Structures are given as C-alpha cells and as structure tokens.
C-alpha cells in the first residue's frame, strides 16, 4: 500500500522540495479547442484551479516547484495522492510512470549541455494526465516545448482537433527531440576531446574524459527508465489514453531505442579515447627511458674500465703498449661505436 | 559456545523493571538476581554487558527457554544483522558503531535482543551504548514508553540505534567534505590513504545497513504475535529512517569512488615526469664521470702537467658539455 514517508528531523506530514532552483515562479495555461485557443501567464493558483472541470483540453504549466504550497494546493484540488506530490517534489529520481484510475503520473528528465565547463545538468519535469488537463511541473524557466506551443498557437498539425492524450504525446515527443539534440552535442564534445587527447595527453584531458564517462553513465541510467516508460505507455494502454495515439507512443518508443543505442556507442568510443591517451603517454615514457638506457649502456661499462685502470696494484702492465693509453682510448671508442651500431640496428 | 570477539574486560547486569505506577532499577553482577523477572506482569528490561562470561548467558538461555543455537548466535560477533522468529520469542542481531574523528577508524559492537512476553533482553560485549535516551524516558515518564508493553521497548531500542546511525552519518559527512576539498586541490599520499580508509568504512557501513533495512521490513510487514498490531507504524517509521540512511550511504560511496578515480587517472604522467627527472640527472653526470675517471687513471704518460694549465680546460669542457645537455633538454620541454 502506498504511504507517505516519515523522515527524521522533519515534521510528519511536511513535503519538501528536494532541489536547488528557487529563483522564479510562473503558471502558464493554454486552453485550446478546434475553433479557438486562449493563453495567459499568472501567479495566482485560483486563476487556474477551475480548469479542472473543463470541456476543451487545457495545458497547465507550472514553473518553479520550490513553491510547495502551490504544488500541494493543485494536488488537493485535482485530487492527487500525497505520495505522488512527494514524488513530484523529489528530483533525485529516475524516470517513472504510475497509472491511477483517475490520472497517470509520469516523471521525465530534461538536459542542457554546455561546451564550457563540459557540464551536463538535469532538470526534472513531471506530467499528470487527467480528464482534460495535462499538468506540467518544472523547476526553472526554459523548456523544449516551444514547438507544441507554436502548433497550438497557429493551428498547425492536428493537435487542435484532438484531446489531452495527443498533448501528452506531443510533450513527450518534444522531450525526446531534445534528447536527440543533446546526443548531437555529445558528438561534438567527443570530437573535440578526441582531437585533443591524441597529441596533448595531460591530466586535464583525462579529467574531461572521465567527466564524459560519468555523463554517459548518467545518460544511460536516464534513458533506460525512459524506454520502460514509453513501453508501458503504448503496450499497457490505460483507460485515460484512447485507442488512437498508441502508434505515436510506439514511434516515441522507437526513438528511445535509437537514443539508447547511440549512448552505448558513445561509451565504447570514450573507452577507446582513454586507451589512446594511455598509449600516447606510454610512448613518450618509452622515448625518455630509451635515451636514458642508451646513455647508461654507452657509459657505465666505460666508467667501469676507467675505474679498472684507475686502481693501483703496483705490478700491472700499465705502460709500454705503444704508451698503452692510446690503445685504451682506442678500445673505448671501438666498444662505444659498436654499441652505437647495435642501437641503430635496434632503431632506437 | 565461545565468545569469538575481543572485548573480554568488563561485566555488569543492569535491570529496569518499570510500570506506570513506578519503576525500579538495580545494577548488579550476581546472576540469580535477574532470573525471576520473566514472571513479572510489568515490562522488564535486562541488560547483560558481558558476553565473554559465557556462564551467565548460558544460564539465562536455559532459564528463558531459548534454543542453544541462538545462544551461539549471541556468542558469535562476526555476523551481519539478522532477525529470527520463534514461537516463544524473537531474536534480533544489531550493531553499534563508534567513529573517531582524529583516527578515521570505525569499530563495531554487536547488540543482541531477545524479546519474550513482557520482557526484553540485551547482550553487549562492552560498557557503553546509545540506549541512554530510552533509559531517561523510562525514568522521568517523558514519552508514552512507560504506558505500553515490551514490544514498544524494543521499538525504542531500535529507534535509538538508528538515531546513532544518523549521528555517525553526520560525522562521515564532515569527513567526506574535508577529504573531497583536500583531494580536489593539493592532494597527498596521506590523502590517498585517508580516501582508501574512508572507502573501506563506507563499504562496511553499507554491508551492515542493508541487513538492517531487511530486518525492519520483516519486522513490520509480517507481524508475529510477539509484536502487537498497534506498534506496527513505529517499526514502519524506523524502516523509513533506515531507507534514508542507506540512500545517504550510497551517495557517499559514489562521491568517494569518483574521488579515487580522478586521482588514479593521472599516474602515467607521474611516471613520465619521474623518468624525465632521472634521465636529466643521469645524462648530465655520466659523461663527466667518465672523463674524470679517465683523467684519474694511474698510467704514467698522461699529459697532466701544464697543457693550458691542466684542470681549467677539463672544467671548461665539463661545463660546456653540461650546458649543451641542458640546452638539449630545453627542447621537447623536459
């Protein structure tokens, strides 16, 4: 049985926003039909409550969930179970889907990637599909649902002639498109990092490579639950979703399949990049140790024999071999050049 | 039947037999005084702080009608937390923890609970625990503990243990903060040793916290007749607290693993730098050693007299070859 969680050092019933963004708050509603649409932006929640019992589909979008009062009021007026609200306010979560007899609750993730600082930031977006309302919950201004807004505003496509199910499909489709553009950004970043890794192998290069590794692991742990959500969307059809609009969900599922495969290929490529880095650094170390060993090989035996002739037994044939010393230097040079020739034979 | 642990120093048996009207306590070391408490209708709490003294634990085992196998379970220390259900009593194995801020060393102590009808029994290996708030609540009639049965006493004990786990998590949180700051900027061999030790501590903590979640889940989900149905939400709360602790442990594990990965990422550069240093120092000294050795040879025909003053020219060529090698090392950025 579903139940609100008790948390230590926190009053029993309180709901907490588990996030970092508290800058801004906004409520945006588009009530659209076949004939006419209306849209407005507001802060009052009473201005948007009465749409619960409305005929034409409406899209209530709430930006800024640090306002837990607004989330609680909306959930109470719309009859949302408190655990679903607690899931909404929790952002340390994976994408999920939950089916209820009156509404369906979906958790998705949005990603903005920056070339500078190579930072992959996630924003959680929640969708509640009700009788004729799709509830949009976000943390901060800036989303990817502008195409759906434009289609609603200029009667493009077929969205104006359908119900809220098509609106849910459209929002999820736009989010998957953002996933595609993020994957393209990852292409660009991999290209830059692979160009730099071959000729400039340093510590910041491998810091960037491991950052990319962690980013891709997070992307995989995000895409797999998304694929499960879409699979449950089209192949366990709830009463809220019509018999139509299921092919569209299947298309979104196919797109998720493609995204997952691309993520796996990215992981393989980045592993190859790390191997390339290690090979390059090892080759430089080989070069330096090669010069060290050539010097040591040429000089240590020669220093040894210089020490042999630098000692004193008082009964040694030290002279009279055509002064001997020129012969000693001749032997020095002969063995030195033989060692040089051997190194050339080894191509060092 | 042997105490497998290390703490075999101190012994004392505390008793807190309590009821709404009044409460009675006595700290005694004689076995016979703590026996007849199973017949008391009022809830009773017996605390045996000596485990190496196997005589007393065996005596209370055959006096309370508890199987010798669970007696061996108390006498065994290297054992993850577990719960067992018997028709007459319930057997629970738990662990306490002590963390030293200075030494970064985490040590564990086992506490074993045998809850029978209207009586709870502990078993500790050492003096010192965290059940003191439960004792104070039993004494000065603070909460609802004195007005309820022994299963509520078990709940209070487990709640105190989970609270101690929260405090330990606070200490580990401070340690991870400082260690992450030190590793990110200005790392050191001591910092790597600290990182390894903290990773080991977190591994132990995860391995001892997951069975605790399992135990609390089995406690509230399917309730044996020993636990009343009214006390289920309390054990449920403790289960939620254990969930919180395990989530924090997992997050800390991820942070520490990333800290290790970033450090080990850059070892080959260290190899290359040590190679460069050694090669520079060896290359600019072996030829000089050679020429000094040749001119130190004990032959008799060495023009070591006059000849442009002798040592000035050899010092000059040593300096010239040294600076030439230095210039050659200036290329390629050595």
């Amino acid at each position: 049985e579903k139940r609100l969680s008790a948390k230590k050092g926190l009053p029993p019933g309180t709901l907490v926003y588990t996030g970092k963004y508290r800058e801004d708050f906004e409520i945006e509603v588009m009530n659209y039909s076949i004939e006419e649409f209306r849209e407005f932006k507001t802060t009052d929640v009473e201005s948007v409550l009465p749409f619960r019992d409305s005929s034409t589909p409406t899209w209530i979008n709430i930006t800024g969930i640090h306002r837990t009062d607004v989330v609680q009021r909306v959930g109470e007026f719309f009859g949302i179970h408190p655990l679903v609200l607690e899931d909404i306010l929790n952002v340390h979560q994976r994408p999920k889907v939950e089916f209820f007899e009156n509404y369906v609750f979906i958790v998705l993730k949005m990603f903005t990637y920056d070339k500078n600082l190579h930072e992959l930031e996630s924003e959680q977006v929640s969708l509640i599909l009700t009788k004729n309302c799709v509830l949009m919950f976000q943390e901060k201004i800036g989303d990817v649902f502008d195409p759906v807004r434009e289609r609603i505003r200029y009667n493009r496509g077929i969205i104006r002639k359908k119900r809220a199910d098509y609106l849910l499909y459209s929002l999820i489709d736009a989010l998957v498109d953002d996933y595609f553009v993020l994957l393209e950004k990852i292409d660009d970043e991999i290209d830059v990092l692979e160009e730099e890794v071959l000729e400039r192998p340093e510590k910041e290069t491998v810091q960037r490579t491991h950052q990319l590794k962690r980013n891709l692991v997070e992307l995989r742990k995000t895409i797999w639950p998304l694929r499960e959500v879409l699979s449950s969307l089209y192949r366990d059809v709830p009463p809220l979703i019509e018999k139509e609009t299921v092919p569209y969900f299947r298309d979104v599922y196919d797109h998720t399949i493609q995204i997952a495969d691309t993520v796996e290929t990215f992981r393989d490529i980045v592993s190859g990049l790390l191997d390339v880095y290690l090979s390059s650094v090892s080759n430089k170390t080989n070069e330096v140790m090669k010069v060290l060993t050539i010097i040591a090989t040429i000089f240590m035996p020669l220093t040894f024999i210089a020490g042999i002739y630098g000692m004193n037994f008082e009964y040694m044939p030290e002279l009279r071999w055509k002064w001997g010393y020129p012969v000693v230097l001749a032997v020095m040079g002969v063995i030195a050049v033989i060692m040089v020739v051997y190194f050339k034979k080894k191509k060092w | 039947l042997v105490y497998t642990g290390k703490y075999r120093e101190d012994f004392e048996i505390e008793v807190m037999n309590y009821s709404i009207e009044e409460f009675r306590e006595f700290k005694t070391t004689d076995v016979e005084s703590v026996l007849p408490f199973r017949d008391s209708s009022t809830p009773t709490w017996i605390n045996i702080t000596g485990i190496h003294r196997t005589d007393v634990v065996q005596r209370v085992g055959e006096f309370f009608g508890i199987h010798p196998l669970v007696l061996e379970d108390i006498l065994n220390v290297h054992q993850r937390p577990k719960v067992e259900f018997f028709e007459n009593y319930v057997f629970i194995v738990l662990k306490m923890f002590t963390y030293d801020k200075n030494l970064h060393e985490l040590e564990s102590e086992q506490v074993s609970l045998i809850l029978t009808k209207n009586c709870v029994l502990m078993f500790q290996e050492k003096i010192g625990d965290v059940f003191d708030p439960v004792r104070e609540r039993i004494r000065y009639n603070r909460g609802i503990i004195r007005k309820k049965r022994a299963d509520y006493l078990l709940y209070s004990l487990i709640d105190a243990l989970v609270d101690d786990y929260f405090v330990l998590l606070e200490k580990i949180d401070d340690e991870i903060d400082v260690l992450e700051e030190e590793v990110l900027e200005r790392p050191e061999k001591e910092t790597v040793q600290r990182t390894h030790q903290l990773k080991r501590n977190l591994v132990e903590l995860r391995k001892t916290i997951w069975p605790l979640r399992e135990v609390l889940s089995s406690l509230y989900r399917d309730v044996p007749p020993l636990i009343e149905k009214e006390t289920v939400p309390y054990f449920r709360d403790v289960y939620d607290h254990t969930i919180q602790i395990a989530d924090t442990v997992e997050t800390f594990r991820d942070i520490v693993s990333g800290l290790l990965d970033v450090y080990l990422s850059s070892v080959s550069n260290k190899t290359n730098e040590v190679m460069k240093v050694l090669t520079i120092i060896a290359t600019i000294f072996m030829p000089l050693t050679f020429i000094a050795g040749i001119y130190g040879m004990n032959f008799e025909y060495m023009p070591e007299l006059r000849w442009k003053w002798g040592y000035p020219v050899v010092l000059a060529v040593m300096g010239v070859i040294a600076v030439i090698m230095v210039v050659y090392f200036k290329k390629k950025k050595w």
Partner: antibody, heavy 128, light 107 residues
Framework: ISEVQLVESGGGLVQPGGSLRLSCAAS????????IHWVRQAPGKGLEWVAS????????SYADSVKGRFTISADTSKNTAYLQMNSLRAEDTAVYYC???????????????????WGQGTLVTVSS | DIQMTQSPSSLSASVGDRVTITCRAS??????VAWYQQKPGKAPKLLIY???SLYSGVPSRFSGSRSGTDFTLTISSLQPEDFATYYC?????????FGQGTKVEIK
C-alpha cells in the same frame, strides 16, 4: 495574491512573573504549508531563537531558555501564530520577531531550514 | 545545543575591501548553516543558505563555503550598504541556534 507579510501584535510592559500573549498575522501565504518561528533579540544583544510551530502537523519546538515557560500555537483558519508567554522574568525583555521558513535538502539524512520573511517585531519590557 | 562561535566580532574595513567572517560549530552540522544581515533598528535579511547557496535577490558579491565544521561568509567587494551585523545559524537540529554576531564598521 499580495506580497508575503508578517505582522506582530501584543508587545507591552508586563510586570515580572506575569503573562502576555503575542499574535503573528500571516499574509500572502497559508500558515499550514510553512513553519512559523519566533526569534528574540534583547536590547544590545544578538539574535536568540525561542520557539517554532509546524501548524499543519502541530509539531512544536522550544528553546531550553524558555522550555516549560512559553507556548507556541497557530490557528489555520485565522492564518495567525501565537506565543503564550507566562511567568516572565526580567531577561525576557526583548524585541520579538516572527519569521517564516522553508525546508531545503542537503543529503538524504540531512535537512535544513532558512528564514525568508521576518516581521517588524514588537518590544516586550519586563520591569518595575 | 550546538554552539556557533563567530569571529571576529568587530570587523572594520573600507568600501571596496574584502570581508571574511568565519564561524565554527561545537559539533557536526551537516552543511545546514545560514547567514543573515541586520541593519540597526531593522529585521534580519537572509543572505546564504546551505552554507553555499545564494538566496534569490541577494547581491552576487556575497559568498559562502564550508570546510567541515568551519563556515565562512565573504563580502568580495564592500559597498556603502554592506555595513551591518552578520549572524550564523545552524538548523541540523529541531533546536536551532544563532551566532553572536559580527559588526562590519566603516573604516
């Protein structure tokens, strides 16, 4: 609708050992969704936290300096939090602020609260 | 009761300087530390929460960080309006406490 405002009322000169009650009217927000705090600042001294109420759950917390001597409570219908001060001492003389806070998140086990909106504060004088 | 020890208590600096206020806890306070500023005759104003996060509407010159049980508030570049008393606060326990204050004076 409207800005978030906190207004205190009830500050007055009370004889030592007596009693008085302070009101905290909440505007711009619902007292249930938030936690109301009382903060005491003695003349010439720093801030001291004195009380706390979580109206929706009814949970209360008191400082040891006033524990067993103060009582904090709220009316959800009136959108007002209260502070019943009795058995006052000479050291209770201070300006009493009313504040609103939210809970935020650090780790799974750790939480913290920060105070956003403060009232003007009313002065209580225990003397003569 | 966790004690917050805030030092210095009588800092003085000129406009455009750099102010550092350090604050220490008697025991572990897991990054649940906030900073407030109070001009004389007024109510406190929130500056930093979670020891690092900057409150909305607070000027960007204010900054905070945590080093274990040690917390610091920095005014990177002083302003004429940046002269007031600053306080600590721990909120890891149900019993929450303040620091004793730190007055930044005009030099």
């Amino acid at each position: 609708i409207s800005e978030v405002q906190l207004v205190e009322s009830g500050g007055g000169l009370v004889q030592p050992g007596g009693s008085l009650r302070l009101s905290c009217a909440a505007s711009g927000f619902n007292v249930s969704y938030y936690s109301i705090h009382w903060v005491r600042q003695a003349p010439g001294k720093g801030l001291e936290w004195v009380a706390s109420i979580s109206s929706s759950s009814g949970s209360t917390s008191y400082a040891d300096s006033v524990k067993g001597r103060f009582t904090i409570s709220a009316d959800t219908s009136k959108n007002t939090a209260y502070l019943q001060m009795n058995s006052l001492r000479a050291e209770d003389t201070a300006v009493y602020y009313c504040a609103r806070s939210y809970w935020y998140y650090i780790w799974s086990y750790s939480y913290g609260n920060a105070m956003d909106y403060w009232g003007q504060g009313t002065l209580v004088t225990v003397s003569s | 009761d966790i004690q917050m020890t805030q030092s210095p208590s009588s800092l003085s600096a000129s406009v455009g300087d750099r102010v550092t206020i350090t604050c220490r806890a008697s025991q572990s306070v897991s990054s649940a530390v906030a900073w407030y500023q109070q001009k004389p005759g007024k109510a406190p104003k929130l500056l930093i929460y979670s020891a690092s996060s900057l409150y909305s509407g607070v000027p960007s010159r204010f900054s905070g960080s945590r080093s274990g049980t040690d917390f610091t508030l920095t005014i990177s570049s002083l302003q004429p309006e940046d002269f007031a008393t600053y306080y600590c606060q721990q909120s890891s326990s149900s019993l929450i406490t303040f620091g004793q204050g730190t007055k930044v004076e005009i030099k």
